């Protein structure tokens, strides 16, 4: 697209993009293990939260919908799901240790999932392709050059698989019981 | 190497060995950035600690002393030094984050350093050797099969270098400098 338009930003490249439309279908759910109250009022208190999270990452590309592949082997190359939280406004981000042997995912609060060694099999139909550009539909980020990024370029190998392993950051906002 | 002696606790191989004897020469030192005082008692109070660590890992092998090599490359290959603390003790172990942009280490101690992609150059003289036993003389541990241990077996390549990257855990107990 020709750049015609005089935006005060200083004539940057356009935001027109997207070969592969990566979309998290990851969902998070939590329940309190212990609810308390003072009977002097009706002031309930839900506490001791117990989080769980499930789903997958799909990707629309050339009118076909693919699903991300994880690695179920036990080496350094295990696609390790690691939950991240911020006490700040995302100024920093710390890994959740297991407390009482569960992931305390407290309702609202902001979370992020990190999963390395992801892939996709786009099929022999899509072999040997260069500059496939991955964009997120819903706040998924891709790791590159030591830093998170809104989009990344991948090439497919002779079979149609992304030639090198990805690493994703997935947003999480739990639902709760009640 | 022959079992004569009836110890309680089954009978098991001896622990004595060490083809190559690794020693941490890592030292840690800290100062409070603010020293304060309760004049009604005269009880001083140190706070805002500022830790620094320095040193090397050496190793004795076949009468010669070698020194560990780190990897400088910007990337996934980089020997990442990560400071490491246990809250109270044992099962707890978490990454030490920078506060006030510096690594506060309190002289009460209980810290460990973790460093990947280490190596050694044992010299052309020690090429092509097949199974070498690594031991520490001062509490350095080596990573394998997802867990630390005090010994590992490695082989040298055509040049005399450890064929594969090591990953170490180094103890440190800081000292207070006035």
Author numbering:
A (entry chain A), B (entry chain B): 32 to 209
Quote the paper.
S-layer proteins (SLPs) are self-assembling, crystalline proteins coating the cell surfaces of many prokaryotes. We determined the atomic resolution structures of all functional domains (I-III from N- to C-termini) present in the three S-layer proteins SlpA_ac, SlpX_ac, and SlpA_amy. The Lactobacillus S-layers are anchored to the cell wall through interaction with teichoic acids (TA), either lipoteichoic acid (LTA) or wall teichoic acid (WTA).
The arrangement and architecture of SlpA_ac and SlpA_amy are highly similar. The N-terminal part, exhibiting the first two domains (SlpA_I and SlpA_II), is known to be responsible for the self-assembly of the S-layer protein into a regular lattice. The crystal structures of SlpA from L. acidophilus and L. amylovorus and observed crystal contacts reveal the self-assembly formation. A second interaction was observed within this crystal structure, a symmetrical homodimer interaction spanning from Asn92 to Asn176. The self-assembly region (SA) is formed by domains SlpA_I and SlpA_II, building a 2D crystalline network that forms the exposed surface of the SlpA layer.
